[PDB]
Design an enzyme around this catalytic site. Structure first.
Site, mmCIF file in Angstrom:
data_model
loop_
_atom_site.group_PDB
_atom_site.id
_atom_site.type_symbol
_atom_site.label_atom_id
_atom_site.label_comp_id
_atom_site.label_asym_id
_atom_site.label_seq_id
_atom_site.Cartn_x
_atom_site.Cartn_y
_atom_site.Cartn_z
ATOM 1 N N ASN A 159 100.536 44.528 12.486
ATOM 2 C CA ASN A 159 100.535 45.293 11.248
ATOM 3 C C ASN A 159 99.186 45.921 10.947
ATOM 4 O O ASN A 159 98.151 45.269 11.061
ATOM 5 C CB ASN A 159 100.921 44.396 10.062
ATOM 6 C CG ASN A 159 102.317 43.815 10.178
ATOM 7 O OD1 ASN A 159 103.201 44.380 10.825
ATOM 8 N ND2 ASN A 159 102.531 42.685 9.519
ATOM 9 N N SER B 60 98.782 41.570 6.043
ATOM 10 C CA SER B 60 98.558 40.570 4.991
ATOM 11 C C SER B 60 97.145 39.995 4.963
ATOM 12 O O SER B 60 96.699 39.520 3.923
ATOM 13 C CB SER B 60 99.552 39.424 5.147
ATOM 14 O OG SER B 60 99.334 38.729 6.362
ATOM 15 N N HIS C 297 95.694 40.441 13.914
ATOM 16 C CA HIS C 297 96.526 39.356 14.406
ATOM 17 C C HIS C 297 97.802 39.860 15.034
ATOM 18 O O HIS C 297 98.381 40.853 14.594
ATOM 19 C CB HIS C 297 96.847 38.334 13.286
ATOM 20 C CG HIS C 297 97.394 38.915 12.019
ATOM 21 N ND1 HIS C 297 96.601 39.565 11.087
ATOM 22 C CD2 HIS C 297 98.636 38.887 11.481
ATOM 23 C CE1 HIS C 297 97.339 39.935 10.060
ATOM 24 N NE2 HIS C 297 98.589 39.540 10.275
#
Ligand SMILES: O=c1[nH]cnc2c1ncn2[C@@H]1O[C@H](COP(=O)(O)O)[C@@H](O)[C@H]1O
Lengths: 115, 112
Positions: free
Chosen positions: B85, B93, B98
């Site tokens: 993401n 987030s 990651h």
């Protein structure tokens, strides 16, 4: 043949048209024909690797290059608000073309979970 | 780095660790979206994939190879999905890059 026996091989060999964003000796980026977001493209290696689960240790730099090209293309295509990168592996992953590739999706809010 | 993932790398707060080497860490997501859901993160604090440099190529590929290997070790032989993401629209987030790996169920389309 160079590029493997999937439909992505035909794209690499330019036997069937595609909307190409980027090309070099190692990879090819082009728009998805069934976009799931306002911008949706794929980054694929020219080397035929069927799926990520069979990638070799020596494929490490190639896979990283797919991600770097994905990020650069996303910037070039103006996805400054963000985007999602996706690799589908196997049955549970939903894979349908067995030539390793990275999805890059943007231009809308992506939701959680990612499918 | 100054994120919760930095604290996890420094062993300051617990996480269910799957694998570690000198340059990355794999651990189970605290809020799993599939029967198996883990993260592979670099120890280098790259805040997001959009700021990764060319010199990071090997490292990013390493995240994916480690993800592949961990998926196999956790028995995800029927398949899985890898996700990275970026930013607001990508639903990122934590601003420490990651790699998500999800499996143990059918993943659906679109991917969010
Ligand atoms: O000829 C093509 N051009 C561009 N995209 C394609 C073509 N054939 C299949 N795709 C896409 O490749 C992906 C294959 O599914 P996956 O294996 O689950 O990633 C889907 O997003 C398809 O729409």
């Amino acid at each position: 043949r160079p590029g493997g026996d999937t439909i992505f091989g035909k794209i690499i060999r330019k036997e069937i048209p595609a909307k190409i964003i980027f090309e070099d000796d190692r990879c090819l980026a082009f728009h998805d024909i069934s976009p799931q977001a306002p911008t949706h493209f794929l980054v694929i290696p020219k080397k035929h690797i069927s799926q990520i689960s069979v990638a070799e240790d020596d494929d490490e730099s190639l896979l990283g290059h797919l991600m770097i090209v994905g990020k650069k293309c996303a910037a070039d295509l103006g996805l400054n608000k963000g985007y999602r990168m996706v690799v589908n592996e196997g049955s549970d992953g939903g894979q349908s073309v067995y030539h390793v590739h990275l999805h890059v999706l943007g231009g809308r809010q992506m939701h959680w979970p990612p499918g």
